[PDB]
Amino acid sequence: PRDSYSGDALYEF
């Protein structure tokens, strides 16, 4: 299968 990802983001605590 294709790997999945969390992506990216601005900072959050």
Place this chain on the structure above:
Amino acid sequence: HHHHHHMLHLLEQIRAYCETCWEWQEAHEPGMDQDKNPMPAPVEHQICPAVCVLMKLSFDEEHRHAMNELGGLQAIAELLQVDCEMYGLTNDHYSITLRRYAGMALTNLTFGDVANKATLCSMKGCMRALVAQLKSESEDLQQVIASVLRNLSWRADVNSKKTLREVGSVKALMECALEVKKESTLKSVLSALWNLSAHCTENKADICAVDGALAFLVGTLTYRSQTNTLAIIESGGGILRNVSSLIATNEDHRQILRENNCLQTLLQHLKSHSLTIVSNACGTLWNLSARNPKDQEALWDMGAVSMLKNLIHSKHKMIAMGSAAALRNLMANRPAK
């Protein structure tokens, strides 16, 4: 009265401090005792307020654009680097705070920014410093650093992938995860690992080679969030999904999964309201149902067939594909019944 005078001041200030530190480093000559060449301390140059204000500005898109025109990423990263190298893993509250604010700004500056991700990864000394902070006593600092590494591992180019691997960020984060107490920290650490586990087979092998990592990751599948969040199950299940391609061909690792009731939990995940969870589970089941009579039989016995059938007509491509693939594996390998 130049328009970006505040931002220019802040960046010049942290740059001048890095020069001050470089000067100290280069003045280590015979006769230069600590009274003639004192080690600079960031409090002496108002560094924590500087990065605090830079962190605040970095949340705004316009300010980020200005920050990027002024070379803000490199300046903030070099500041973080020099303090980490000079003072090591200290518990000094001033040092922890400035490192946190700096990393928050770096997370903000790397969000959706191709050039900045590549630039930060190319700063090898800074990358080594970031990775070392994962061993800080401060879990809040760990959380921030993991946030940075998360952004750097999304759409990483060839150089950046190689760097992230060479600075040992995969094993560092997996080992960090085994030690975290706070949910906030674990969330960020697992998000970064989720992206990194996708880069290459070697990264998957490094995760699997950490003693206790597989059992820990299966553990995250039934995490009980104190907040009303599914982030841990999503990211933990995500890493497991990515890594399951290797586990599938490893009997010892399959056995660790069985000991931790992995298949059974994955089936429960198929009932989730989170598409991410269902999707991750479908991928993992796809791998684990492949070429293994034992796990195929187990899945039949647990009623996986009818559960997967309920998902093949899904609007969500990953779910539809994963469910059908796993179902195919089971259908082609029916036990004597």
